[PDB]
Design a protein around this ligand. Structure first.
Ligand code: CYC
Ligand code: CYC
Ligand code: CYC
Ligand code: CYC
Ligand code: CYC
Ligand code: CYC
Ligand code: CYC
Ligand code: CYC
Ligand code: CYC
Lengths: 161, 36, 160, 160, 647, 169, 161, 161
């Protein structure tokens, strides 16, 4: 994975030049937003199971999926769906703390669309479930850090499609 | 020193025979012997 | 025993024996009166079974008694009837316990390389069990034979 | 299924089906007619069992029905009765299968993770099935009740 | 038929071991150049090989004489050679007529084939070809052939080959010992089969005969014993690094944990404990956990520790639940503290890759494990196991008949196909001939030709793509506007049609020196119709260069069908048709066939420019499952937002 | 792995239906035939080695090229592997007989059979022929034996023929 | 894998006849070459570290590949290519002493294209590097043995291209 | 493991003789009392979580061991003792079902006695806990099977001491 610090180092490393003032401003922006990122991560970590709880209730519950014939009928499937949204929330916080969507394109999305197609998991529904996470996360933490969380949750939605 | 040339030199041609009808067609071979 | 097989399967999943597993025990414990009856009719009537089994084997296979055989000596010939007596002993243990496990651990697990290191043919002993089976079930009653039959058939399977 | 369990055990060792397994399938086949009798009484009285044991749950544990509870409201009470209807249906699958494998695979694996996410006390769902056990037992004969209870008691153990 | 395919990569079983094969593979597995030992194996063999040629040459020529002298001694009552294709234990000579012709033909050819395999054994220089093919032969031949007659037949051939050759004691002893091995392996009864017992209920039990694991090159097994000299101790540790990291990383990058190396060299922690600590180390974590998805890292962890791929769907489901609970350490702990690991490797033995030759293989995860045992496995980042296992139970997936790679991305321009080599994501599925793919219509759902074939030439009314037609009169059609009329209004409409006709054949608008000006003005004059104009743009050398030539043949056919008809192919029946034309006639005739097709004529007239009519479900998902464009009522429960009653 | 009971459960569980009259009748049909299914399984357990060997001996007389050079049953190594395969098909049909379902036949046999046989160079034609010879060997022996129902014996071997073999038409 | 001898026997076994003439001619040419093929291998084995040194110097060094932006820039990537050219030298040695490129088929070209395209290794730069090995080995061992190595080293070159 | 049914078999196996009437009388006793063992196992299986709690509260809770300074104070160690007693009851059920205390000799008292001395686990406190298990299981099942159950729980008590 790459964080915002490593990303601007690697961009300078590939060119084979020292970090200039324009590249240094990218770091200073991260060191300014770093306090906002750490505080946001602490809130989501505390309400990790709680954010999912509201998100499933808003989007997934009392729909087609949970009813017999759907992809969330059996208790094993339902628990796996909670597990999947527990995955998505945990990795979105990792990417938020890093300040780069490198971990998502490495451990989350790179070979997820193929699995979801094969298992018969509806992508259109799970995207809406992550959008349900996005709304809960932004309401709990704030508008400033929820927008930051929003980008990386949208990144998962884009990779799934 | 030029004895080392096995795959670098001239390749030795291998005899691969044409595949012939086998004892599965012994019925038809019997029929072909009587068709004269 | 089928009792052991259930508690092995339960311990493997790290759980108590299930509803269908406990009923499988219940079925065996009721038919245990028949299981006892198998033992007496084979143990006491061993001498008739063993003699019929050996005379049918050496007739069908006149090789071991023939020159360049396997059991030419009288001490070697007693050892063939010793094996016959041991196998029918293993049959009784298997039926009484209810599964193949008593026969498995004692006289099936690594039984091929046993007779390979003694120059005794395993394809020769697979025909030995069949004539022992045929002699045993003939003495047994009709409904009793069908219970004792698949225990012998498993020995045949593991041999060849 | 019992047939499922017997084959899988036989295949893992790769030895065909042992006489011990074949006897247990025979016990399952013979007891299949009794299994269909218990299942028919459970599927026949599905409306009454859920209603009686549901009412028993709301009297014994009023806290779930009380405001602040999980099953408070007309819609939430209906969902609880739907849940009890699901587990009774799972029992009928279990009774038919002989074991508790269909109950496990469909509606016992990850129930603790499910009801934690919903905010449902797992000990209260344990009470509902235990009350479903008592109502169903008081509709059929003693031998039928003892057979059916073994499936119910497995759910209790997985709940609490 | 099966609904999923794991792949059918080429399996190369070693039928028999030779001296060069035994020497080279010995250092290959150790990842070393052939040292003073393995060179001397070849040196002595290459010198003796010249003599070994003289052994066979005599035996190949006099092969007829050896088998004649053998058969005459064994078989009595006539001549056994009528129909050619020292120590007697107590054999009886078999009658020719009594044995029967069919049994005699078997008997004669085997006697020749025994000698033939002896000649191959000397040439190979290793009696492996004998040991394999002779060990479990006594039992199967016993049924309808006497054993006593066979032993004296080989013993006759032993004497026959001895007297005919008889050169030197350094030469004849090679003939003697290989025949001595031959009779001893034939005297030996069939050994017990290698039983691969299932580790749990989920995995099936297997069996392999004691002949298949006698030739197929035994995997070098290293065990850490505390007393060993430090050179072979280093060889054990290097092999342990070669198992966990797929390669010797301590040689490559000098990446080594000496902290763990010291404890195993002493015997503080076992090899089981070493593998445990090495697979939860940050050195493994960075390389085989960090770059991969949780499912794929699990699949890699299987081959590193257990030395095999996940066998069953239930096994992947179980071990994924572990890696979700506690992560990498918990996964490693589950893999090392398994009933399988301690049965195969125990405590001292280094894990080894158990493939086709090592043990019995199951017909479930064949191609999935074949690609996994390859060194190109940690580049396939798409899971192969959980994908195939789930697809096995499910029906046939939304996929092109020739694989997932044959499907282009549903974009405006550019033929973009998933590469087989770059990021292996090949998903084979057994598609038969009469298999029609379900396609989503761009326009109304009622206007699909599968259910409504009459509504094939119905235009999508603000649901699908814009239809371009030469409805308006072309400029200079009639001699009404005589000479002048500089402001002829019907001129911009036909030019916009041309641009759209270019945009359909080639997704993007072309450059200045790419536009076919001759074809444009013929359409504008009214010499050719749109159908002919589309055909000419697809018959252009530029279309050949840009879409046909750089792409796979069937990829190029599929993309052409998605451009000219605006529709993916239904299945095999259509794809095989155009592929047959592509083989015999060429690219230009494939263009011709797609335009002159009845379905083209029904959908688009002589004046109609083609358009995107049907999409693949995967293509529409890329369009309408993103953050935007996605509606609220697709796969979400919609609650009616009403103002509360207290408000 | 799924039997006829589990398949029927999964079918009704999917829709979320209680076991109706049609469901109970299909189970009752299994339980009445079950006694014949175990008795058929007891027959093939008795004659496991004899049938496999005789069916192979019939196959290599039908298609002689298998045991001839360039054939994939030529060597002892290949001959032992083929008889092992013939032992496998009989063993998994043995499971399929009691189960009365071809899920066990699909999951553990047929799923990755085509991929394997295409890899080593194992023929797929003589294979299904050898399975069909075994079928005729069981059915004739079951006709000889005192068995009331023998129709269910054809089911697993025909499914083995249908799935594995190439689609001709 | 298979060597030349087993390939001759396999072809004889498929036809189902003895090693008559044409089979013998390929064998005697193999055994005569064997003594010098061992000698060539032993020299290559001893000079394995030095052969790579000159080969990288001729092809890879002082180029855009070693320069920042290239695939042989970072030290980890440098040592990987060193190991790779050590693999190419060793497996060409293996195929020389086997007299068959079947070892190159199952162990090298099983997925050499699969790894190189996924990582983003330049094919042309690798081909030039192996071509540099071919010239060095021909100068070190001999012109006769260098051509014998040449056919297997070009097999990898054609195997990449 | 060695069951009571297989106990007389294995004893006759070592002797190399058939099961006599003086040996089958013990087998007849197992066949008669077998239905009692199954019902006893069914009650314990259903109430597995409750037996533990009723024993821990009787002996272990509100004592010096559960209070600071003891070995059953920390939650980590509390969960260990709960886990232990869960395994203690489960394996005692197996010995009750099998009819022999061989599984307690094999799968319980193999190195359990020496691990408890290593960690400094009180032997007297563990014995008291198993004695508390004994009294609860006898009250739940009955006096008929509970006395029989008490033999196998005494085997653990005598094994630890
Ligand atoms: C003083 C430093 C010593 C010294 C150096 C020396 N180095 C080379 C050759 C190379 N050195 C590197 C190393 C790196 N390049 C990178 O990209 C990185 C990572 C950031 C490092 C550390 C490489 C790859 C080269 C190759 C050059 C190229 O671009 O092709 C040489 C030349 C070797 C030769 O003979 O060709 C030298 C001389 N020399 C000494 O003796 C000093 C102790
Ligand atoms: C010079 C050769 C060029 C070059 C090479 C290069 N290779 C890698 C990484 C790998 N190389 C392999 C290949 C093999 N390993 C094997 O086991 C075998 C068969 C014996 C071969 C041929 C593999 C699998 C890897 C990846 C694993 C590893 O790290 O070792 C790299 C590094 C790429 C990266 O960024 O990870 C490089 C640079 N590249 C060049 O620039 C030269 C033209
Ligand atoms: C919940 C939002 C929706 C849903 C989820 C669902 N997932 C599974 C099972 C799996 N989940 C994954 C996916 C991942 N593997 C990874 O590596 C990552 C990234 C870290 C993830 C998230 C996989 C591979 C599995 C298979 C494992 C298993 O069998 O459990 C299921 C279960 C489906 C089944 O039983 O086959 C479900 C239901 N699907 C829905 O219905 C929700 C809308
Ligand atoms: C009644 C015994 C107790 C109770 C019930 C209750 N459950 C829910 C929510 C759900 N229940 C389930 C569970 C299942 N559905 C299945 O298909 C299966 C497998 C057979 C099970 C076990 C699900 C999925 C839901 C969600 C509803 C949906 O279908 O989408 C509720 C509602 C919780 C809420 O507020 O959202 C309730 C009340 N709760 C109690 O208090 C009783 C002890
Ligand atoms: C310019 C900012 C950078 C750049 C561009 C570049 N693009 C191509 C070729 C293609 N562009 C696309 C992408 C699209 N397809 C779509 O549907 C859309 C949205 C409407 C877009 C933008 C495609 C499909 C291609 C492939 C060929 C084609 O034109 O159809 C190239 C050429 C790549 C080649 O090797 O052929 C380039 C260079 N690259 C840069 O260097 C800029 C930073
Ligand atoms: C009705 C039971 C439920 C339902 C149906 C529904 N379907 C669509 C759209 C399509 N349906 C299909 C499927 C098929 N076409 C085929 O060729 C076959 C195989 C014979 C089938 C079954 C397709 C391809 C489409 C896409 C449009 C098209 O016709 O090409 C919709 C509309 C979806 C949309 O948003 O456009 C609907 C509503 N959905 C329900 O609510 C019912 C439970
Ligand atoms: C008896 C006096 C002689 C005899 C008769 C016989 N042979 C067969 C057929 C087979 N022969 C073999 C043996 C081999 N396989 C190998 O790999 C080699 C080379 C080392 C040999 C020689 C095998 C496997 C068969 C079976 C395949 C086939 O049908 O050809 C039979 C038929 C067996 C039957 O009854 O089914 C008979 C009767 N063979 C001898 O060894 C004696 C010289
Ligand atoms: C005999 C009927 C035919 C035949 C058989 C044959 N098969 C192989 C190779 C393999 N067989 C399998 C297949 C299976 N293993 C399973 O788990 C199952 C499902 C129960 C099957 C059917 C496998 C995995 C292998 C390869 C490894 C192994 O032996 O276990 C061979 C060997 C080919 C070789 O020469 O290497 C043979 C001979 N071949 C015929 O010609 C007959 C028609
Ligand atoms: C109050 C917040 C809630 C509550 C408390 C409650 N706890 C118990 C039982 C015990 N609590 C512990 C746990 C700990 N001991 C430790 O060392 C630690 C970690 C530092 C903790 C938290 C223990 C050991 C006991 C057992 C009692 C004993 O002293 O032996 C009870 C008693 C349960 C009973 O009825 O027996 C209670 C009431 N319960 C609530 O309802 C509150 C929400």
């Amino acid at each position: 994975m790459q964080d915002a610090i490593t990303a601007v180092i690697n961009s300078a490393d590939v060119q084979g030049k020292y970090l200039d003032g324009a590249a240094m401003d990218k770091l200073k922006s991260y060191f300014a937003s770093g306090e906002l990122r750490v505080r946001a991560a602490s809130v989501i970590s505390a309400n990790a199971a709680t954010i999912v709880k509201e998100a499933v209730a808003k989007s997934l519950l009392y729909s087609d999926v949970t009813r017999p014939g759907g992809n969330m009928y059996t208790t094993r499937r339902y628990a796996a769906c909670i597990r999947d949204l527990d995955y998505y929330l945990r990795y979105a916080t990792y990417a938020m703390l890093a300040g780069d969507a490198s971990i998502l394109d490495e451990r989350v999305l790179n070979g997820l669309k193929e699995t979801y197609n094969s298992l018969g998991v509806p992508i259109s529904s799970t995207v809406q479930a992550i959008q349900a996470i996005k709304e809960v996360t932004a309401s709990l933490v704030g508008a400033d850090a929820g927008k930051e969380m929003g980008v990386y949750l949208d990144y998962i939605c884009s990779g799934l499609s | 020193p030029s004895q080392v040339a096995f795959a670098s030199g001239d390749p030795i041609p291998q005899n691969v025979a044409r595949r012939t009808p086998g004892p599965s067609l012994n019925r038809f071979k019997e029929m072909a012997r009587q068709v004269k | 025993s089928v009792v052991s097989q259930v508690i092995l399967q339960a311990d493997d999943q790290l759980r108590y024996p299930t509803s269908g597993e406990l009923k499988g025990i219940q079925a065996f414990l009721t038919t245990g009166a028949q299981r006892i009856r198998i033992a007496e009719t084979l143990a006491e009537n061993e001498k008739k079974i063993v003699d019929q089994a050996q005379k049918q084997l050496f007739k069908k296979h006149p090789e071991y008694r023939a020159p360049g055989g396997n059991a030419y000596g009288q001490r070697q010939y007693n050892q063939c009837l010793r094996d016959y007596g041991w196998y029918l002993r293993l049959v009784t243990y298997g039926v009484l316990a209810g599964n193949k496990e008593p026969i498995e651990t004692t006289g099936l697990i690594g039984v091929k390389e046993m007779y390979n290191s003694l120059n005794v043919p395993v394809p020769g002993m697979v025909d030995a069990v069949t004539v022992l089976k045929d002699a045993a079930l003939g003495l047994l009653s009709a409904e009793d034979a069908n219970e004792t039959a698949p225990y012998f058939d498993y020995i045949i399977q593991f041999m060849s | 299924s019992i047939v499922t369990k017997s084959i899988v055990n036989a295949d893992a060792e790769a030895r065909y089906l042992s006489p011990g397994e074949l006897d247990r399938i025979k016990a399952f086949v013979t007891g299949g007619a009794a299994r269909l009798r218990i299942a028919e009484t459970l599927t026949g009285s599905r409306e009454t069992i859920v209603k009686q044991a549901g009412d028993r749950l709301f009297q014994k544990r009023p806290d779930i029905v009380s405001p602040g509870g999980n099953a408070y409201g007309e819609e939430m009470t209906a969902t609880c009765l739907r849940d009890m209807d699901y587990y009774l249906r799972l029992v009928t699958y279990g009774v038919v299968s002989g074991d508790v494998t269909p109950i496990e695979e469909i509606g016992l694996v990850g129930v603790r993770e499910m009801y934690r996410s919903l905010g449902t006390p797992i000990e209260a769902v344990a009470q509902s099935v235990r009350e479903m056990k008592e109502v169903a037992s008081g509709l059929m004969s003693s031998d039928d009740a003892a057979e059916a209870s073994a499936y119910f008691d497995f759910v209790i153990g997985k709940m609490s | 038929s099966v609904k999923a395919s794991g792949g059918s990569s080429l399996a190369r079983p070693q039928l028999y071991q030779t001296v060069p094969v035994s020497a080279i593979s010995q250092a290959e597995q150790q990842d070393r150049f052939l040292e003073g030992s393995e060179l001397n194996e070849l040196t002595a063999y290459f010198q003796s090989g010249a003599l070994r040629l003289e052994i066979a040459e005599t035996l190949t020529q006099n092969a007829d004489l050896i088998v004649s002298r053998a058969a005459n001694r064994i078989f009595t009552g006539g001549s056994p050679l009528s129909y050619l294709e020292p120590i007697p234990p107590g054999f009886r000579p078999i009658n020719i007529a009594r044995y029967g012709p069919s049994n005699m033909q078997k008997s004669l050819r085997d006697m020749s084939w025994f000698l033939r395999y002896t000649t191959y054994a000397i040439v190979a220089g290793d009696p492996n070809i004998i040991v394999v093919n002779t060990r479990g032969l006594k039992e199967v031949i016993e049924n309808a052939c006497s054993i006593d007659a066979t032993i004296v037949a080989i013993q006759e051939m032993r004497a026959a080959s001895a007297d005919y050759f008889r050169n030197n004691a350094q030469a004849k002893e090679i003939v003697l010992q290989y025949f001595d091995i031959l009779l001893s392996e034939f005297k030996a009864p069939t050994p017990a089969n290698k039983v691969r017992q299932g580790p749990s209920n989920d995995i099936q039990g297997l069996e392999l005969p004691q002949s298949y694991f006698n030739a197929a090159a035994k995997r070098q097994k290293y065990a850490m014993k505390p007393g060993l000299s430090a050179l072979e101790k280093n060889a054990v540790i290097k092999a342990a690094y070669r198992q966990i990291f797929e390669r010797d990383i301590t040689k490559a990058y000098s990446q080594s944990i000496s902290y763990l190396e010291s404890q195993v060299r002493n015997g503080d922690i076992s090899m089981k404990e070493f593998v445990r600590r090495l697979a939860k180390s940050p050195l493994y974590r960075k390389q085989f956990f960090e770059p991969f998805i949780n499912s794929r890292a699990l699949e890699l962890a299987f081959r590193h520790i257990l030395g095999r791929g996940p066998s069953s769907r239930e096994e992947v489901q179980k071990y994924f639940s572990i890696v979700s609970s506690g992560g990498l350490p918990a996964l490693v702990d589950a893999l090392v503290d398994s009933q399988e690991y301690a049965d195969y490797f125990g405590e001292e033995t280094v894990p080894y890759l158990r493939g086709l030759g090592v043990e019995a293989q199951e017909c479930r995860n064949w191609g999935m494990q074949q690609d996994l045992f390859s060194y190109s496995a940690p580049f396939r980042k798409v899971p192969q196991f959980i994908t195939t296992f789930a697809q096995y139970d499910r029906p046939l997936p939304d996929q092109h008949v020739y694989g997932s790679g044959n499907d282009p991305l549903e974009i405006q321009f550019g033929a973009i196909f998933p590469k087989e080599t770059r990021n292996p994501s090949k998903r084979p599925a057994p598609f038969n001939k009469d298999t029609k793919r379900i396609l989503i219509h761009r326009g109304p759902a009622v206007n699909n030709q599968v259910g409504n074939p009459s509504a094939v030439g119905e235009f999508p009314g603000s649901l699908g793509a814009k239809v371009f037609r030469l409805n308006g009169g072309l400029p200079g059609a009639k001699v009404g506007k005589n000479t002048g009329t500089s402001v002829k209004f019907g001129e911009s409409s036909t030019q916009a049609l041309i641009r759209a006709a270019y945009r359909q054949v080639f997704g993007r608008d072309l450059y200045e020196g790419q536009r076919l000006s001759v074809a444009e003005i013929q359409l504008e004059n009214g010499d050719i119709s749109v159908r002919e104009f589309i055909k000419r743009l697809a018959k252009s050398e530029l279309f050949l260069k840009l879409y046909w030539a750089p792409h796979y043949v069937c990829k190029a056919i599929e993309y052409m069908h998605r451009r000219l008809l605006g529709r993916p192919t239904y299945g095999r029946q259509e794809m095989n048709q155009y592929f047959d034309i592509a083989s015999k006639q060429g690219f230009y005739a494939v263009v011709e066939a797609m335009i002159d097709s009845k379905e083209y004529s029904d959908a688009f007239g002589e004046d109609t420019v083609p358009y995107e009519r049907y999409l693949t479900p995967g293509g529409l998902q890329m369009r309408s499952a993103r953050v935007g464009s996605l509606r609220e009522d697709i796969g979400q429960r919609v609650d009616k937002e009403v103002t509360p009653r207290f408000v | 792995m799924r039997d006829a009971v589990t398949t029927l459960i999964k079918n009704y569980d999917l829709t979320g239906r209680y076991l109706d009259r049609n469901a109970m009748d299909e189970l009752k049909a299994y339980f009445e035939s079950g006694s014949a299914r175990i008795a058929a399984a007891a027959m093939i357990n008795a004659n496991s080695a004899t049938i496999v060997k005789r069916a192979a001996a019939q196959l290599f007389e039908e298609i002689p090229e298998l045991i001839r050079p360039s054939g994939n049953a030529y060597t002892t190594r290949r001959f032992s592997a083929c008889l092992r395969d013939m032992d496998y098909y009989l063993r998994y049909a043995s499971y399929a007989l009691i189960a009365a379902d071809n899920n066990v036949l699909d999951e553990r046999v047929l799923q990755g059979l085509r991929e394997t046989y295409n890899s080593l160079g194992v023929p797929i034609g003589p294979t299904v022929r050898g399975i069909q010879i075994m079928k005729e060997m069981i059915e004739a022996m079951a006709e000889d034996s005192s068995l009331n129902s023998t129709d269910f014996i054809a089911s697993p071997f025909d499914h083995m023929t249908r799935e594995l073999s190439e689609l001709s038409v």
